[PDB]
Amino acid sequence: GAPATVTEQGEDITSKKDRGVLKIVKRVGNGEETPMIGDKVYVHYKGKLSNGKKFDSSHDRNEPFVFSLGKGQVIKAWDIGVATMKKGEICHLLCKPEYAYGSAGSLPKIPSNATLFFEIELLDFKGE
Numbered sequence: 061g062a063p064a065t066v067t068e069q070g071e072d073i074t075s076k077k078d079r080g081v082l083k084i085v086k087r088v089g090n091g092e093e094t095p096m097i098g099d100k101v102y103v104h105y106k107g108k109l110s111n112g113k114k115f116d117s118s119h120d121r122n123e124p125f126v127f128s129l130g131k132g133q134v135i136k137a138w139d140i141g142v143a144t145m146k147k148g149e150i151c152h153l154l155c156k157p158e159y160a161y162g163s164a165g166s167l168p169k170i171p172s173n174a175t176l177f178f179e180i181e182l183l184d185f186k187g188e
């Protein structure tokens with residue numbers, strides 16, 4: 061399925077080239093611009109664990125997830141991955157635990173040493 065495909069065929073987008081964050085662009089976005097550090101970004105997403113279970117979805121809340129990029133408000137894989145996205149892009153992101161919740165996990169939903177899969181749509185980004 062999609063998690064296997066990003067694992068096997070995704071691009072390593074880490075600066076360290078440690079295959080900790082892998083990406084496939086699923087829907088090509090607009091032009092060339094990507095958000096910059098500190099921008100307010102609006103996304104829709106769904107996340108899955110490696111046992112196949114969906115653990116979260118913004119779509120199901122009927123409102124986007126909003127954060128300021130590059131500030132550690134989200135897991136490292138998201139600061140790295142969303143920074144690569146164009147407006148309107150949809151991507152798949154595979155996040156090894158070192159770029160997510162590590163050995164601690166995040167109870168109740170995220171176990172220890174969890175590789176996470178996301179589908180992310182970048183709706184908008186704006187400077188404040």
Ligand SMILES: O=C1[C@@H]2CCC[C@H]([C@@H](CO)CN1Cc1ccccn1)N2S(=O)(=O)c1cc(Cl)cc(Cl)c1
Pocket residue numbers: 107115116125133134135138166167169170
């Ligand atoms: O960094 C995150 C990432 C990436 C952005 C989208 C979500 C948000 C909103 O739930 C949570 N965070 C930040 C965060 C804040 C507080 C505790 C743990 N993580 N998550 S997430 O991995 O989907 C997530 C979803 C759910 Cl339901 C619980 C947890 Cl612990 C994590």
